A and B are shown apart, each in its own frame.
Chain A
Amino acid sequence: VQLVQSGAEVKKPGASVKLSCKASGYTFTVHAISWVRQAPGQGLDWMGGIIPLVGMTNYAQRFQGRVTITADTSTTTAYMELSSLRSEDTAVYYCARGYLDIWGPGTPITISSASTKGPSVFPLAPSSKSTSGGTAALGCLVKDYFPEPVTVSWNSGALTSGVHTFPAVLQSSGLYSLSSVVTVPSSSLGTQTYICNVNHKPSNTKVDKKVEPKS
């Protein structure tokens, strides 16, 4: 069972957005798919759902008139279209299968007039200055992007232990910056390879940076 959601986006105020939720691993037509918004302060808010068998829908009253939920059984895909976007629509939008077992990973939507900007990625190279005992730290600095989020993996997902991807900071310029770091044995910096994979879906930017030791 899997729900795969479309990527994060910045949208201007007044625009429309159509989010998608691709279901797999189960009988699509016999489960209600709900859309649930999670916004800072407002919390979790149900927006409505649809039963893809006959396509019957149901909408939270707060969202009536701006929201349209549809489903396409041929592609086992549910859709949510939100129009007349406003700043307070900034949130992560989840699809979830019916209570709600199985949620998608959410689609972050930022409502803003500012333009999308993909990150610059720089190595945080291990040196004697980033050793503690027999442990070395290394990482990637992911600077100057908009909107959130950037996601970071290491070695295409094969390296996860000891990874810390920090919450982004907001720079005075209004762009975001974060670091992703990991601790490894200092003894094997010469034989192991460490690559940070950075994805900024709002700009479709993908960067891989090999982090080499400095002497």
Chain B
Amino acid sequence: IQMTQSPSSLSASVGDRVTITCRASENVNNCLHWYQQKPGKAPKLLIYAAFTLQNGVPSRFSGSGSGTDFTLTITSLQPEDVATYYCQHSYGSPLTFGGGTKVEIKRTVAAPSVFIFPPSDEQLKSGTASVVCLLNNFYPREAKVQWKVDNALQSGNSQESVTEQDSKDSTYSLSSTLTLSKADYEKHKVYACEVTHQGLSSPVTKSFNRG
């Protein structure tokens, strides 16, 4: 049996009512269950038998539907509900899951706090210099991070990673890591990361001198 969820993702504000749908290719009566999953964690059962709330789950989660058409509702979206929601049918075998609906939060703009870390002495002894720029607790997710070495704009030697949306405050954090050989690192004096973001009225630069 084929399980089809919609939408694939949605964005709502805290307090909004969220509606997610699951469509089964054939009748499954009430053998339809809902799960919540956050990045890096196991799924958690929310609702079984299409409407029965699992003990400990808050009452703002409710399910309805019968046959082929099912709805998961969140009546007042809370920040900790950011997650992907999965339906699953158990009418016979094989058990199969929907493709998931990602629920994301819209919130007010928050500027990043910006931090920079010079390479450790232990890493330098190994012959590599990683420089880390951290953007912490910002919203929305889009951010621009540029590296400058001795005032020259870099390309080609950095990698970025962004967190999932925070379950308490709905923000993101981002890291940008510049990696050079010890020799190339010792060719230059000033290392700086410049951050542009919607919540910053001007770009923020964090810099240090190799010494």
Binding site for B on A (CB under 8 A): 34, 43-46, 58, 60-61, 94, 96, 99-106, 120, 122-125, 127, 129-133, 135, 137, 139, 141, 143, 164, 166-169, 171, 177-179, 181, 183, 214
Complex Cα gap A106–B43 (Å): 10
B148-179 vs A, Cβ < 8 Å mask (1 yes, 0 no): 00000000000111111000000001010100
CB distance from B43 to the nearest CB of A (A): 6
B123 engages A130 (CB within 8 Å): no
Q: A129-B208, A130-B134 are in contact. Are A58 and B93 (CB under 8 A)?
A: yes
Question: Which among A44, A58, A137 has the highest number of chain B CB atoms within 10 Å?
Answer: A44
The reply on B73 being an interface residue by CB < 8 A is: no
A124 engages B159 (CB within 8 Å): no
Binding site for A on B (CB under 8 A): 33, 35, 39, 41-45, 48-49, 54, 86, 88, 90, 93-97, 99-100, 113-120, 122-123, 126, 130, 132, 134, 136, 159-164, 173, 175, 177, 206-208
B130 engages A164 (CB within 8 Å): no
- Candidates A43, A60, A103, A164; contact of B163 at CB < 8 Å: A164
A105 engages B97 (CB within 8 Å): no
B42 engages A137 (CB within 8 Å): no
Complex Cα gap A130–B132 (Å): 10
Complex Cα gap A43–B43 (Å): 12
CB distance from A155 to the nearest CB of B (A): 20
A103 engages B130 (CB within 8 Å): no
CB neighbours (8 Å) of B164 from chain A are: 167
CB distance from A59 to the nearest CB of B (A): 9
Complex Cα gap A106–B39 (Å): 12
CB neighbours (8 Å) of A164 from chain B are: 136, 163, 173
Q: A104-B42, A171-B159 are in contact. Are A122 and B113 (CB under 8 A)?
A: no
Supply 20 further A-B pairs (C-beta < 8 A) apart from A103-B44, A122-B122, A183-B113: A99-B33, A103-B42, A103-B43, A106-B42, A124-B120, A124-B132, A127-B118, A129-B117, A132-B113, A133-B113, A137-B117, A164-B163, A164-B173, A166-B163, A167-B163, A167-B164, A168-B161, A171-B159, A181-B134, A181-B175
Q: A103-B42, A104-B42, A164-B173 are in contact. Are A43 and B113 (CB under 8 A)?
A: no
CB neighbours (8 Å) of A127 from chain B are: 117-118
Measured CB to CB, the nearest residue on chain B to A124 is B117
A139 engages B177 (CB within 8 Å): no
CB neighbours (8 Å) of B160 from chain A are: 169
Complex Cα gap A143–B129 (Å): 12
B115 engages A129 (CB within 8 Å): yes
- Candidates B44, B94, B123; contact of A61 at CB < 8 Å: B94
B97 engages A44 (CB within 8 Å): yes
CB distance from A95 to the nearest CB of B (A): 10
Complex Cα gap A95–B211 (Å): 52
CB neighbours (8 Å) of A103 from chain B are: 42-44
